[PDB]
Symmetry: T
Subunit: 142 residues, 12 copies
Amino acid sequence: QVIEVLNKQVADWSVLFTKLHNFHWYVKGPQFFTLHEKFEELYTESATHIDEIAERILAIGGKPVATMKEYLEISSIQEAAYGETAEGMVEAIMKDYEMMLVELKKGMEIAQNSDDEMTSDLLLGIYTELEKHAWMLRAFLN
Amino acid sequence: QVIEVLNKQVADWSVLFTKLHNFHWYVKGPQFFTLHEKFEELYTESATHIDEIAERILAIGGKPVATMKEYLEISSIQEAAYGETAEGMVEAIMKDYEMMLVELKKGMEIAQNSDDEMTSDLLLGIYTELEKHAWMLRAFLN
Amino acid sequence: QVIEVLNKQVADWSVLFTKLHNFHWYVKGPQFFTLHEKFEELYTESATHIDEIAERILAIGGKPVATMKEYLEISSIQEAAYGETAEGMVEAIMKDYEMMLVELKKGMEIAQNSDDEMTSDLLLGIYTELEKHAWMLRAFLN
Amino acid sequence: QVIEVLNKQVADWSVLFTKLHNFHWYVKGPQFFTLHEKFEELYTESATHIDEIAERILAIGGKPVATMKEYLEISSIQEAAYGETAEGMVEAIMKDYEMMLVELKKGMEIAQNSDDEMTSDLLLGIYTELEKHAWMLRAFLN
Amino acid sequence: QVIEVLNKQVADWSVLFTKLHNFHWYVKGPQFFTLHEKFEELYTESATHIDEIAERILAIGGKPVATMKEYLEISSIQEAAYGETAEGMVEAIMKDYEMMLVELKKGMEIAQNSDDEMTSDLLLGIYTELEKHAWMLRAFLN
Amino acid sequence: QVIEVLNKQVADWSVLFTKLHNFHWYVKGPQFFTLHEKFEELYTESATHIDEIAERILAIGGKPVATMKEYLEISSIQEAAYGETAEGMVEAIMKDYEMMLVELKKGMEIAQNSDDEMTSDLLLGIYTELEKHAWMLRAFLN
Amino acid sequence: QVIEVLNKQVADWSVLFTKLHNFHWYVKGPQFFTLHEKFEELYTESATHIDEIAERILAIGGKPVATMKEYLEISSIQEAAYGETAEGMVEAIMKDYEMMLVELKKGMEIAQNSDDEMTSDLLLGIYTELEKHAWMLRAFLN
Amino acid sequence: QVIEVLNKQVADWSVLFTKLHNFHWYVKGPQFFTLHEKFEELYTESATHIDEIAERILAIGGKPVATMKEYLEISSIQEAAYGETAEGMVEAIMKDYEMMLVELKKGMEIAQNSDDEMTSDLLLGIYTELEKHAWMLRAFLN
Amino acid sequence: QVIEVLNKQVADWSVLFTKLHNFHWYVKGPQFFTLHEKFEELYTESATHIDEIAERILAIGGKPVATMKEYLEISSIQEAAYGETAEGMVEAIMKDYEMMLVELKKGMEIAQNSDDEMTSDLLLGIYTELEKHAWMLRAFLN
Amino acid sequence: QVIEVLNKQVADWSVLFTKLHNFHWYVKGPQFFTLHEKFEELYTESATHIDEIAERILAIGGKPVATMKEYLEISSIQEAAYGETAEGMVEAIMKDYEMMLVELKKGMEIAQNSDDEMTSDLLLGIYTELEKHAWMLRAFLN
Amino acid sequence: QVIEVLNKQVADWSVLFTKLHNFHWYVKGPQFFTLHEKFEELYTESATHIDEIAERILAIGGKPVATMKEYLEISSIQEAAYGETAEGMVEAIMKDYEMMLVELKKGMEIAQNSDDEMTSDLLLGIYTELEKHAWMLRAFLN
Amino acid sequence: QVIEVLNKQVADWSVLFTKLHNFHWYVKGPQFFTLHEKFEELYTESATHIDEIAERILAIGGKPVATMKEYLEISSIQEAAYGETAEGMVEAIMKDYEMMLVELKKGMEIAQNSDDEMTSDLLLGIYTELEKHAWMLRAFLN
Ligand SMILES: [Fe+3]
Ligand SMILES: [Fe+3]
Ligand SMILES: [Fe+3]
Ligand SMILES: [Fe+3]
Ligand SMILES: [Fe+3]
Ligand SMILES: [Fe+3]
Ligand SMILES: [Fe+3]
Ligand SMILES: [Fe+3]
Ligand SMILES: [Fe+3]
Ligand SMILES: [Fe+3]
Ligand SMILES: [Fe+3]
Ligand SMILES: [Fe+3]
């Protein structure tokens, strides 16, 4: 179902939320201030997705996963490991975003196949959002 | 340590964050709109605590817990079981808040004993905050 | 005199101010939040009237009553009444407003008769204000 | 033509506009304030659609229907009947929204078939909007 | 009754609302932008009147007409015929406003006669509003 | 005519505008700052009246006087002899306001007699405005 | 009890509210404007305290006094005899504030003794507030 | 003296103020709205100049002219001229602005010669302002 | 590639940016103010497109053209020729927009064919934007 | 050098900053509130100058003095002896401002002579600023 | 002519606008975010200059260059070559700004010589602006 | 006395104010912009403390030190130190903050001992503030 695509999104984003807080809290170096900031911007966005998506499946008669327990057993995002570097962190969520772009494309496919371009449009937005981030994060590194 | 009091706070608040979203998403009845709203207000506040507290222990040389995994193994808050009632939900977090008031009083005790009224002050604020909520939540029911 | 009409208004509104706070503080039930709010809106309005009217008689050479003592001995609004219901409270100030509409019409009569449509206009405004409230309050009940 | 899909939207929304005012004005009960409010929110949105859609067909060389007379002979929304209940009203427009989701899907079909995903995108938005409302309205009831 | 004066106002304004949208949508010429704008300003105002008036009669125990059907059988405003001119449109609603000034004066008469200067005051405001418009609209032409 | 009452208002206010600037510029003493300010507040208000009134007579088919020349030959306000005192200035415009209250009452009389309570309402507002000022100005002195 | 300390605060502040309005209305002299203003600032603050405190005792299971009648029989603030001086008024509430500082210190003592530094913190704030005012009020005089 | 240059500015601007109101009030045609607006923008600007300049000479020990009487006997700006065209009006103040540019250049000359580039700078600003207007006004015509 | 579609957009928009400034600067007539304004609105929008598009191709691994030199050798928009009329200018960019709608449709085709509805969505937006403008610009003329 | 003129400005303003705080803190009398305020306004302005000037010399390759030590050995402003009068304070900084006008004129001379009208322009602004203050301060006294 | 100085400014700024976008888009490294931002700030400012200057010459009877074609054949700014470094870019526009300071000084010379300190003042501002930037840009490097 | 603790705070903060400006002005490197900014944020905060503390001792009958002269002879903060590194500066005030935490703890001790938890609370706030900064500053380095 599409509800499953969405529910995995919920789980993933929920993980990102915490993971971004971690990086928000543990980042260090001459890029502290700028990165401390960026991550808060990112988890704020993550929180937005969590509610929209949930309310989306909620709008299509689905039941959104709503326990960290479930999130953990369904999310494919690997939580923080600590000790990460400032660059490590940027590198880390950047990969996370990219690995999510694929799951999204797949998600729009099935959404469209289940005659639900509405949900597809929602997903398309997130896709556009992350793609821009990936570029800036990448440019920060490369 | 005080860091432990704070880190349990972080874990508890993190759980509340998700639990409040759950109620935000699953609430029903003629109190929908007003309760759908209130819960969002509450998880927004919860998110504030998560960062202040974390950054507090972070300011006192501690290392904030930052994985849902840890949160789950340390929080004392019961993750939402489904199918609750609108009143059930209100009743539910109301109890959660009250059970937290006690842990807070204890938390200020030790904070003060460890010569740290700063952290105690932080905790005192949350206490005041929840007490008001408990009253309003309670008055909503009783 | 017109000053007497106005001074009774002052007294009445002053009582309403406190009475609305009481209801603001003691209301209970599933209408808590919405009614807790409405009453604050109402006593805020009441406070507005208290100053305009006072400053009105003050603008027409009068001397505004300014002690709770006098208010009590001149206001015709009940007050107190502790164990009141949420509906009881709505029902209560709704009647208070209606009983004030009459005193207002009378007040505009004498204001006009004393060649003071200015004060009449001021009173007319309050009249319009209360009439709308009465309707909403009433619709809330009926 | 697509212009016809849009023009029916215009008519429908125009009806909703008035119908929502009716409910805005005639609603009663302990849900007054909250529902009095919600309906105004809804007719404000309806008014938005009326202008966008009109200006859309206007942008694609069409001529928007612009008389209540025509609206009445083309809209499929059944105007108010009075006597409705607070729940009745919520139940009423909720059904109206759902019956409009179908007409929209159909509308996007033909839009796409006439090589106009632009108009389809416009319609898709309204679809998403109503779907969320339907859920909240529904949750209010069920 | 006064309720009848008001209800005709509601009907008239409701018609103006649509008629102003029509002109908003169909206007053309070097005065497009400025007139496209002005009409939107005007139908926004019209919508304000619709609700105030309705809520007025609603505040005086009346029942506001709330169907386009009734509006059509009671309004005295001519629904826009198409093909008008930019000047034609300005000329058109300008006359509409003037024809309304008379009905208003009459309306205040009866309002006053029925001991209701409140409603008269409401009507007086609209009068003042339209008179200014008529002048500007007129000056635009003459 | 009523146009004559209004046109005298225009002239008077126009004079006040300049006279208030004079006091704004020439005031001195320990009340400088507070009075320097108050006068600017007053001439700003004066400017408001000049336009409303003008546009009022303009709305009732009249032709507003629009030359300082005419203003001078029709206004009854005493231009500012120079060298006044801070108290003198306050005392000065206070008298001007009071002398205008009378002309206003007269103005509303004729407005009403000419079946124009609209203009009367406009004038009524100014009356209310000045009466308050007079009190504050007076209290400043007495 | 602490509830009694708070309830006396409520009563005192309620009296201050009216007493400050009195001074707001009856003040005179070259300090009119500045003092007319200051008092309004003060009674606005007073109103804030009335609600916080009430809602505080309300949060700790207490029942806030809510009738002017009770206020009068419990407040220790001297209602305003009439005819005071501008300086008299400043001198008057300044003393009132100082006499309240003592009751507050006492209030924090018992709050702390009853293991309620929360309420103590609330009271501490008011203390800080008044102390600053006292200085400015004093400096205004001395 | 420089005070004389400035005082003529004051007088001129004062005249412009009224003259712009006249045009604001008597303009007509298809350019009504846009010109009705522009003139108000212009007299608002004029009022700004009147106070800055006055306060400028006031800052350099001068005494600003402050009576319409003096303004009339010193200003070089025409005034009156009733039956003027929309274009006539634009053409009219445009010439007024240009004739002021010359007086300004002269004014900066003497200001500089009297070792007062401060006043010169002030004047320079107005110059720049008017030059832009002249262009737009001109482009409106040509 | 899609990058080529986007890069031509960049070039085109960059040209429009300058061309719109030209019209912004050289426009004349009784439509000056309104058209002077509109063009600034348009080049502001153009600038928006330039950055979004660039950053879009930048997000899809492309390299955005970034020299006026390249813009000139790739854009299909014909720069201004001066001497244009107010109507000429409106007529001019109106055609430019329409000629761009076609290039856009083509652009979405290839975007979709290269499995990139993201970019297609971006382009779709611009399409909708221009279509509305074309209508208003057209209505201004016809 | 010009850097020396600027650096003396920095020192002077730095002294003013503290001196204005002193007056802000020690002022007394019936002018307390208004003067308490004015001084804060002034030291806020002073702080602005300190940074602009510093950053100015910083922009012209200079090195801004940045220690209170240096400020003291170079500033020509008389630190505040204690116990001044309210009028004394006003009189005090007023003289300080005037004594600075001269140093500024001199400063613009050398700035211009060193082919740096940029810095001169900066200084010119401060000059204009202080001149206005001097007048108001003076008018407050005289 | 002065028009020529200004028109070269227009051309130069126009080039800077694009060149700054280039750097905005192609910058990379740990300074990405901060520099990506700064450049946008800079091209925003550049765009401001383009219009002010153009409108300046437009105000002095000149005809502003308005084609990228002309810009290219008259600007002295080197269009970005690709592959620069983050530092390279900063170094690059920093030099551009400095090379512009000289052309500006020359520009004010001739402006002054042609009796046009107005335009000189305009140019002086830009000078001040760039000088500050150069310092910050420089400090970023050195 | 407590006044002495506070007065040292005043002196210290006053020094910090200047010292932070120095760093604000002399910082260099790839961290320029971000550090140039941070320091301004810090001295703005410092200025806040200077006034609160002063006004605090002022509220407790004390007399705040108010001359740079005294500041210098009582502050324990270094100052000067010209050729400092970007990191050096961060390292520098970070140590300053930490050395202030100790003086603050001591300060709260004596405040509490002198029965003044009010002042203690004020100090507690600053403590919390600095502790957070120290962490961020530290994380920036380590
Ligand atoms: Fe939500
Ligand atoms: Fe944070
Ligand atoms: Fe008041
Ligand atoms: Fe529209
Ligand atoms: Fe309504
Ligand atoms: Fe006007
Ligand atoms: Fe409350
Ligand atoms: Fe002024
Ligand atoms: Fe960008
Ligand atoms: Fe700075
Ligand atoms: Fe422009
Ligand atoms: Fe202060």
